[PDB]
Amino acid sequence: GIVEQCCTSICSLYQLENYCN
Amino acid sequence: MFVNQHLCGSQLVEALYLVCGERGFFYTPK
């Protein structure tokens, strides 16, 4: 989930937008 | 740019807040 993708590994704008409503 | 960094804890929630704006977001640390 978002922690694995953006905290443990490097985030992206796609990763953030994937969690927008 | 912050979107291409490690973002953890409250910095991740704040990044979601700024990027998502009026859409809002979900934060599911699992």
Swiss-Prot record, chain A:
Disulfide bonds listed in the record: C6-C11
Recorded superkingdom: Eukaryota
Listed name of the protein: Insulin A chain
Full-protein positions shown: 90 to 110 of 110
